Symmetry: D2
Subunit: 318 residues, 4 copies
């Protein structure tokens, strides 16, 4: 096949209509405004192409076959890589002054909101809480279909080692944390009645409340309904299982996936931050995977993590 014909450059390179040129006097910098946003759209199509393929692997039960975890992780990594380039793409619009923008602003009258249909589909398909005709069919499908947050949440609940009958990760974790905090209180109370001792008693009482808050299923159920948390309590246990036992072969690639989901999340946030900066330059943590950020910030000592029995060691291996 011929390069231009394979890429359909007859459509791609014939979609640049300068509204200034069309409505009278052509403003040169307006071409940049078209090309930059068209390039963002090409990349949003690729991000959606990868996101939907990953979403489908989970939905159609393929993610159960652990062989597919290489494909799942690599595609999510490609999404973060594409998002890193889109964040760098703001440097192109930075070459157009706010003064030069004003010379063509009246020909298109740009709103400051996120007018991209693809970006709204991307936000909905990942799991963002938060006028289009025919496009409202795709937008309704994005809200109705299972989000990546939902599909990951369902998969996280199936994490091995959670079963109370076998291994019982949450039970052993609560036992080691309660016994570890009690052993730390004994070490702190042993010290002299100095001001440095009372600063440690107050800091220990604050950290003890935080550590034990992890086990309050009712507090989590309250935050879930309040919107302050998105993952189910059983999915929190499964995500923490993967974090604490990431070295175990069966949990190595799932850990890369969880790391990748947090990267995509903060990359989406950096892109939105840059969009807002650009809007104000020219005119003047509600993250999908907050639970993953939360579980990684519970400062639990390495030695308090329950040990792995030789029956569980051979089970969490390929």
């Amino acid at each position: 096949l011929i390069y231009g014909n394979y890429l359909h450059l007859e459509k791609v390179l014939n979609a640049q209509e300068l509204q200034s040129e069309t409505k009278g006097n052509k403003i040169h910098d307006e071409h940049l405004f078209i090309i930059t946003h068209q390039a963002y759209e090409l990349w949003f199509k690729q991000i959606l192409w990868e996101l939907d393929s990953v979403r489908e692997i989970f939905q159609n039960g393929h993610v159960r076959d652990e062989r597919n975890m290489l494909k799942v992780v690599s595609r999510m990594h490609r999404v973060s890589v594409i998002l890193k380039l889109l964040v760098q793409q703001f440097s192109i619009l930075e070459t157009m002054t706010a003064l030069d923008f004003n010379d063509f602003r009246e020909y298109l009258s740009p709103a400051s909101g996120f007018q991209s249909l693809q970006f709204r589909l991307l936000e909905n398909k990942i799991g963002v809480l938060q006028f289009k005709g025919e496009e409202n069919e795709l937008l309704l499908k994005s809200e109705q279909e299972k989000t990546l947050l939902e599909l990951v949440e369902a998969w996280l609940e199936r994490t091995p080692g959670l079963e109370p009958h076998g291994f019982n990760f949450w039970g052993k974790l609560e036992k080691n944390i309660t016994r570890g905090l009690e052993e730390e209180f004994i070490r702190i109370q042993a010290k002299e009645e100095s001001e440095e001792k009372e600063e440690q008693v107050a800091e220990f009482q604050k950290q003890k409340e935080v550590l034990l808050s992890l086990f309050d299923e009712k507090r989590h159920e309250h935050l879930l309904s309040k919107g302050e948390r998105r993952l189910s309590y059983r999915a929190l246990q499964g995500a923490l299982m993967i974090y604490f036992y990431r070295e175990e072969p069966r949990f190595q690639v799932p850990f890369q996936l969880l790391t990748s989901l947090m990267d995509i999340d903060s990359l989406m946030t950096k892109w939105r931050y840059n969009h807002v900066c650009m809007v104000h330059r020219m005119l003047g943590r509600y993250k999908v995977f907050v639970d993953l950020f939360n579980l990684s910030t519970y400062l639990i000592p390495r030695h308090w993590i329950p040990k792995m029995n030789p029956t569980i060691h051979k089970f969490l291996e390929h």
Copy 2:
């Protein structure tokens, strides 16, 4: 206007035809191959949009009005900025393994050459040496004045070159010949040590290079041989801007010359990356060389002719 309608996303987001899907079994990674090269093409259209606008400012005599130098420099800077992003865009294809590429390679059979019409137009329009409707644009790119040619014409008009006036080349040759003579006297005075012969050899090598600058005949030979592109009078004008860059009238032209070299090595880095990508998946001469050359003539600061108060106000 509406976002999707203004951007004509009905054409842009409906031009992705996977040859694997069309010819039977759809290969997922093939979509990346389409989108990456389509995005390169959108940026080549923008690069050409800027390059042609700058090329026209020179061709239509607007570059004579010095007020347009902000517009010329800023648009050339935007070209280097876009080129920096295109070099970074290779990281996207780096996320596709050579093994995964092979699974769709047979559906399109990719040649290793630079099959982009826009990139060939970009190369010809800057000044890189040399279907049916597309062949009209490809012929026009070779026939029309290149950016190298338009810059060369403008460089010949640089103030300060006139032999009656300041006579830059004459004073430069006089200070360099006298500076080299003064250095030879200092070097020959030393004892016959190994450190002295290292200085005699290094001086004789630098002397040959410094005086080579004034050999108009040698330059005329290299120009015809293709090893040099700028006319001898344009070399003098470019060096005038380099040596007197601090002077207000030469501040923005210096930024322009700096920018042309940036674009040059960025085009070369993009071509280098293209070759790396081709070998990664299959396995199988700079336009402004004179500007790079003039910036590496290692001429001492004090040998540069001083500026008279009449030339300083000018």
Copy 3:
């Protein structure tokens, strides 16, 4: 000279002391925490080296000689270039997990604040509102900031003089006459819903455009801290924006553009620092706000006062 001796690599490559290793068990990832922050410090030293040299060109009156504007602009550009790399440097710490960080936090107990002396000196020297270090920290607050030195230079902008050109007078006359002519065009339209939306949008934009000429409102915000540049420096900055094409204002426009880049790059670095702190531990102040403000007054091109041939030759090299 010898490479390692010239660079003093005997100090540079012998300043990495892992507190985990020294206090018992060595944690591998802790070396990254040292190297990243040391590399930020090397770049802060270079940023300060450039910032102070530019600050001095203004303070010693060299910035008066327009020949020095290439040196001023290029060094400020180098600062933005270095800042772009420091923002990209967050990708290195991103390769260390919050879990691995916990394994060595406790050996150093890191505070979430901006504990860098060099970064505080950089903030103070640009114009952001102990012991031997306290001498440099006091000097940074006492000496003239880059905002102050640029403000003084902006007040000397040619074309502001009321006797000759009178930029602010002609600008107020064209904006007041342009808004009046626009009100006449808007009132002429039929009683449609699109007409009432334009009457409301015009009344809002008219209030904003005329606010530019309210010296009292600006003097109030200046004292409140909500604005930093003097009213005469605002006029000078707007003169450079509107007549940026004019040769004498080409490089000063690049400088003003560069100051805004550095400003939002400093803000992006601070934003990234906050993100990194919350990533590892868990849960506006723009020096040149006036320049951002003057660039977003959406004044039509034709309303800008025209340039007379006497002013054209004056603003030329």
Copy 4:
């Protein structure tokens, strides 16, 4: 601990000695020349810290315990991440003109070669084929096992190579010989097509060359290949069965080694460009075999299938 004391900023921020300032007239831009190369050195120390830790995991037999593969892959990724930043660091020196460089070049007289001890140790420790105290570390780097050597030893232990069980090389040779024969039959059926007959004969020679142990043994001795023939079989096993859980992280490692390799080459390319910019690279890559094995264009269906006994094992 306190920020500046923890970082030992008393040494770090007091090691900038401008040779121009010390030898008389201080040149401002010379500070950038010091800081850029000092920052490269801080990162080379970190790259070596990671490279040696990974090198040790292989050397001390920890890489046998597959649990350590997350630590191995993530640290090798961190090396590529740091190398990406060092390639981007050339943009800082790009802000210093060749003309401004000349104003301080005489105070240090810079050579065009790679004068970094740390970079030479990095090259030797990966597997690339000053004096005194430094010569002890430089000798140790050549004598100790390289990353190429440690990876080569590990690759020879790849499961599935055993001729009794699975016999990967045997089944691969059988399917490739039968597949090429079936392709020859399809091609010879067409009329005298001639571009496909010539391209088939060339590709057939390349595909079968994979099984010529003698040709590989010759190239290995000649230096044109670095990995042992048994390590090539093991690397190809990981490539073809990358989807298999036990080969997922090893495939990431092999991909990462090639990324580090081409990033080292891009850094060297940029160093050469920078040297020529201020004054007047090729396929000699440590992991050439990994690049080679990834570009053998063997059809997906010719890859031997996986039996349920081998599927549960991997």
